Amino acid sequence: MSTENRVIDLVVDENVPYGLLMQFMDVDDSVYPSTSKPVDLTDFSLRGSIKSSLEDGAETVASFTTAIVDAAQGVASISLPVSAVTTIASKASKERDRYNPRQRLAGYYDVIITRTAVGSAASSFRIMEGKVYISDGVTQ
Amino acid sequence: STENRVIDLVVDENVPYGLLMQFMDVDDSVYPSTSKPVDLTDFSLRGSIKSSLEDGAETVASFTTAIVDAAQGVASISLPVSAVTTIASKASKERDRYNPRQRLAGYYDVIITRTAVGSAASSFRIMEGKVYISDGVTQ
Amino acid sequence: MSLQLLRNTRIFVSTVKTGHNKTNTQEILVQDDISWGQDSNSTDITVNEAGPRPTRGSKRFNDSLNAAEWSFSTYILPYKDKNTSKQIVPDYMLWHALSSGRAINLEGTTGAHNNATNFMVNFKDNSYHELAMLHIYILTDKTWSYIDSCQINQAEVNVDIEDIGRVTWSGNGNQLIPLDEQPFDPDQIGIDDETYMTIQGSYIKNKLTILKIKDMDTNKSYDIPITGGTFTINNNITYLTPNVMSRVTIPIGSFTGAFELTGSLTAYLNDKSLGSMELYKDLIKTLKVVNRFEIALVLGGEYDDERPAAILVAKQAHVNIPTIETDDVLGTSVEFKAIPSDLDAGDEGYLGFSSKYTRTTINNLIVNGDGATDAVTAITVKSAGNVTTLNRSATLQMSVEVTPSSARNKEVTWAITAGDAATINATGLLRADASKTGAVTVEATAKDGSGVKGTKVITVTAGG
Amino acid sequence: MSLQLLRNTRIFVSTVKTGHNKTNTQEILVQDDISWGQDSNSTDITVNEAGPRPTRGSKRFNDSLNAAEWSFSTYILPYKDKNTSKQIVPDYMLWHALSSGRAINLEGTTGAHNNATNFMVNFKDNSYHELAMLHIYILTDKTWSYIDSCQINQAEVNVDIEDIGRVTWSGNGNQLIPLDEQPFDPDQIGIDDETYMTIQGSYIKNKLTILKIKDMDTNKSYDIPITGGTFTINNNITYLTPNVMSRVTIPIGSFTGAFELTGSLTAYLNDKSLGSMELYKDLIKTLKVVNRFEIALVLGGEYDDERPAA
Amino acid sequence: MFYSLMRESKIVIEYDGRGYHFDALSNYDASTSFQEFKTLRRTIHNRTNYADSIINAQDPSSISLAINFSTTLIESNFFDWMGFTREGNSLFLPRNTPNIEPIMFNMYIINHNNSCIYFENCYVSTVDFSLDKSIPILNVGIESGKFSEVSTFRDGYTITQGEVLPYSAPAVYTNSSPLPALISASMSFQQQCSWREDRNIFDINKIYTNKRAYVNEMNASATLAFYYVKRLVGDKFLNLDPETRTPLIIKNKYVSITFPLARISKRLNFSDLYQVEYDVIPTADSDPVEINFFGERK
Amino acid sequence: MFYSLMRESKIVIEYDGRGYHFDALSNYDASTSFQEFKTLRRTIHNRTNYADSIINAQDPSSISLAINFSTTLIESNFFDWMGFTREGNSLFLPRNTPNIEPIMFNMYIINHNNSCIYFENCYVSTVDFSLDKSIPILNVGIESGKFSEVSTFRDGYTITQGEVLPYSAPAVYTNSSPLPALISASMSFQQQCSWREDRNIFDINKIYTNKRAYVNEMNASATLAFYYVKRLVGDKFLNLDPETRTPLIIKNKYVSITFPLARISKRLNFSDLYQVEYDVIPTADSDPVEINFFGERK
Amino acid sequence: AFYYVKRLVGDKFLNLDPETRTPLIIKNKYVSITFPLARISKRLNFSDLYQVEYDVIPTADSDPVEINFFGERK
């Protein structure tokens, strides 16, 4: 009955690899209390992309590298290497904000988890969405 | 709590600078928070002082990292008096509002790093902020 | 032993109280309506008894001094100086202290900064509790005086047709101080005859006033011949004075209020297409809480040959619901206010002054923000190899040609508008498929906001 | 492509928004001082910080529309019409909407009702929260417009000697609506030359103004030659508009206030019997909390032969 | 950065999995706060100056909305959620409170840039509107247990309030005999619930939020203001005597609150013009109080 | 029908069978109300929503009159009715309260068309007037037990207040030495009675009205406001020390309140111009407090 | 007293959650009150422009609260 929070804004650090890991857990409310079992990520793949705008025809700033850490514990990690961080930093907006000159808007990102197989239905699902920001660094 | 990486350094003119970081790992599960210090193995810190955040900015100076007493977690970041003079040379002539002795010299950030402790380059930024030169009178 | 006349007053604007040179102080050509002064507050303590033989006596105490008031009017007189060859208005530091709170830097890109094409003022850097600080120096005949630590409160500009373009300045100072000795030689700092000739060569006449208004929510440009108007740049600066019972006090510091860029524009009702009547009817029919209008008031007119002009641009403006002003000839009033996209973004509007505005220069000032940066004027989209059609399952990577050839932003976006028989990417590589037997279109628009259209009707068929 | 002049304005008063005929709409002969319009309210939201580098930006919202204001002046022009042979004033529905809140019925005995002798207006039936409802139609040159659901707020009558008898109307409407198409042919509904001649035959001159004042507590009629005066019929009508934060709003309904019939009469002091001096001295000598006077202001004068009068 | 303007907001009430976006909102007021346990342990050893304060609970929020009447009558759901039984477009005050706990619902206060404040476990505790010579408006008062900040939300695109109803003068009747010289008819309805605080030792080192509540009572009330008017000497209909049972109805063109039997108490004020004031409550055995909602044309 | 205007009214006080029409009345305020017993019998069987309210008593009325001083001095009867003993035109504050119960009288508030409100079992409970630089006026406060509506009444055609007394500046003396720099002399007199509620089980199903009352105490008080004035350094006459017993008189051209021995407490305010404030009450063994009423020419 | 300002969606630095211990300083050009560790409670008002209100007190084990008095030039 409560609300979800699909909109998440990420903040990356320039010159540093960014690593985010998501855990999918099955839940239920019954006579016995909340029973949680990790979701088995088999045939589950992720794919995320970043563009500088929502409107059609937006320039693709970069794309995220997807991997699954532990299927039994239902843990998947979505991250990008340091070179991708530099690429996004180059393509970010040059407009600074006072009280914190570090952060600059980089664009919008989405993540779809999908399960593709002959017996599996062609079902996709946008797990998250939001904007990507950059914390500019001076080292390196 | 939350995040407090942003702290500004005020270095003194004509005086060598040295900062002593007692790395620590507090956990608030138990009401008296655990005072366990992190153990400094396979750790290196890197920090450069660069005027402004724009790309291609000239490197005003570079921090000199010291790792001592790894067991109890403490560490030192420092730079010689010559580095202090080089920083003070390029500092802006406009003085800070709250202190008429400080002048903005640039930006900085130090980055911890694990080098293949588990075949992973787990390097993340520790702190950040602005470096301020405080004009001296002795010399 | 002498009387002082107002006609012999000379006003100098300074940023320094010592070391006065030609880059810190210049004379400001003022008019008859110049005024300055400082008022004082007092109080009367009176005993209020009720019995017979009551005490009837008062007593006065000086308790505080008010902030000094000054005001004067000047002509908008853009010109180019021989030293730097960059268009500059003589009272440029007034514009800077109005626009931004940083040190003056005409080479920069915020506040009052000039160029080889035009003099520009933008309010992108006015987020300060104490804007650039001036010192008005007043010279009446022989005696000197000045107001200490002034701040430009506002600048009134009245669009009064059959009159010359003029701006009225107002502000406040900490204290008016009379000076017995000459601060600087007014003969040297004051403007000489050569620059006076150069200035009087360029005058802005309020009669030749064209206005450019466009509804950003509907893309409808209106043709409104103005009758009279005014716009203000207001800072709402309030001066703080301490309260001390034992000694009189003068203001110590100030704090800028809310930056307002409002206006009011009167015009007659026109039944012609895209006239005043259409704008009034659209505004009273929509009845919207918020409006997005682009307003570009161009004092001095637009012409192919070089003419002086002063331009106010409001990118995202807010227009009040108009009212009909019943006179011998029916009219209306278009009261507007330039609001920013975000509160802490500034950029509510900007101004461009120059004695050399060709129509293209003001157009690219309006659409690009600078008179020197060229802007695209027209586009015809080009296919890959002068191709006129396409068949099923065939690519068409279309290109673009733009005019002028020196526009700063030569890029375009891509879109499909009419028909559903193809798809286009960011680069422009149009792609189709089978079962596409309809006529589809392709469009392109520039990223500088010029409003240029690139269209082509490609006759995609089912193939041979 | 045309400019519109105020001199070509023509005003029609209607009780219906459709089916306009000669019994629902008539032209009202207005003067130079005619005016109409509608104002809008707004608001500025400004951030008021105290620190260094404060935010200096504002924002405007249209929040509501005010009630439409209209006003015009007309000459008091009684005459008899050929169709009914009953004395009637051309702007009679204005008088009715001022007087009573019921449907117009000139055959009745309340509000604006006429006769073979005179046209009469009494306020015996004005106990209504919403008086008779009009619709002012404005024709400037070629374009049309009208104010929706008007109400007669007041009627100013200024007794200005060496001038003609005139009445100034004021009121409010829900909304001013511009009409692109012609509602009704103004040539037919507008007054023709015959009734214009009949009207201009009868004019009321404020100079020939006799006043009849009598103290009902003492039975003392006074002879007061007037110098200048005015009387008002006021309804104190207030228009209610709803407050909605998301959308602009126009007034929705109204409510009549307290009906006031005041006046002011200036005259010179006369030492003659039953003059101004006697009235002034009696009034300042009695010093009574309440007075019972009979006042009959007769514009246009009284004469043995037939004369126009209000 | 992003400032939050009240005028640029949207209030959506989430009930039964459907979003009731309440447009035609004149003004709303809300606040959020936390409860602290601040004790100062001054001892003979150390007469300290620094307190021991820990935040352990969320103070319940008190949200008040002012909503204009609308043609689609979404605002009657506030009576529906507050406990009234429904038949057609008329709301009955039940003889007995139906359930122990009130009807709980969530509420969103949307703003630009995915900003939102999420009030949960809300219940309608007060609804009162004054039928007067100004446009009627009902001020509802809801109390929340838990407030939160969320990124995505529920926005009532379809379920919304229509155009505001035009003003119409109120009139109060006894059966069908009008009561003369009305000034201001104010109606009040309440669901005086109470939070059941169940903060226990298992919630130590955690923030507690109220979750469950019970209804102490429901009631319908009205205060009528008249001018002291008498038509006869020693009149029987209009006087100051109390009326144990009398049928009353406060009628409008769009709403009519009916008391099948009413207990009226009168109060005379010797003001500039004498005013009498009624205090109308339903009797013990009176039939359920009616509240009709007529959109247009009754 | 007939509306009731305050300006068109006449207040007549009925004492001893004679009507004291108190003209020169600046303003009066009054209210009438009833007492209810409203209980809600919510049970586990039926958690009802309808209360059990019965009107069983009339709440005592609190009528306040503001009366200008007059040349015929009818207003001194308020001191006479409140308990002061009379000798000539001077009213004494008795050493002991004479009777247990106050002096009861009825009061009418007449209006046009035979309309009236009849307050019964009234007593004067407060009288205070401020001698100041404005026209003096004494606000009397009476409490009623029973209010009623009557057709015919008592109207004081003859017994009426004359012309208002012209203003005269107040002056306060000690013996015959004037006290300088007076601002506002305010005098207060009270008869702090209390209603004896005797509502019993024989009054069930009936409306009860208070009938009998007893005097808790009478007192005379005055608050004097001066400007802090000193004539000498270390002055003895004018200072801030309390004065256990000192003869005081607040004198006017038409009234003079005398304290044969007074207990004065002083209070200094550091305002724009320093002001001292006295608190004058008669001592334990002081002679009766005098209140003289001079019509004209003393 | 602040204005309710957020820079990100789901921001961590600026929110309504209580802060058990955080170093705070209310600084001026002539005075600076320092709380080495502070207990902050937040309160949001849905006024014309949303305002948040803090309630800053020093913690139990916080170092002494500083009050500096700078005459001129710090």
Tab-separated table of C-alpha atoms in Angstrom, chain A residues 12-17 90 96 100-102 135-140, chain B residues 5 46-48 50 52-55 107-109 111 123 125 128-129:
chain	number	residue	atom	x	y	z
A	12	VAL	CA	29.726	9.951	-8.806
A	13	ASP	CA	33.253	11.067	-7.925
A	14	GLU	CA	35.591	12.216	-10.684
A	15	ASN	CA	38.787	10.178	-11.190
A	16	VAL	CA	37.365	7.403	-8.969
A	17	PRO	CA	35.506	4.222	-10.007
A	90	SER	CA	33.942	15.785	-19.797
A	96	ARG	CA	28.394	25.461	-11.315
A	100	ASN	CA	29.244	23.566	-3.450
A	101	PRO	CA	31.121	24.114	-6.740
A	102	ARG	CA	31.906	20.384	-6.945
A	135	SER	CA	31.648	15.481	-7.805
A	136	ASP	CA	34.579	17.086	-9.619
A	137	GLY	CA	37.990	16.143	-8.267
A	138	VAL	CA	41.398	17.770	-8.699
A	139	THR	CA	43.669	14.785	-8.093
A	140	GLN	CA	44.576	12.905	-11.286
B	5	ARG	CA	34.303	15.214	3.759
B	46	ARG	CA	47.389	10.865	-2.837
B	47	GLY	CA	46.515	14.547	-2.877
B	48	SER	CA	47.186	17.473	-5.200
B	50	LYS	CA	45.038	22.573	-7.971
B	52	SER	CA	40.015	25.928	-9.564
B	53	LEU	CA	38.112	22.816	-10.678
B	54	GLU	CA	38.211	23.477	-14.432
B	55	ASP	CA	40.008	20.954	-16.618
B	107	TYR	CA	41.304	23.132	-4.072
B	108	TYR	CA	42.404	19.722	-2.843
B	109	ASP	CA	41.304	16.169	-2.114
B	111	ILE	CA	42.191	9.621	-2.064
B	123	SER	CA	40.338	3.772	-4.081
B	125	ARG	CA	38.183	10.037	-1.835
B	128	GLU	CA	38.035	17.688	0.170
B	129	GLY	CA	37.687	21.443	0.404
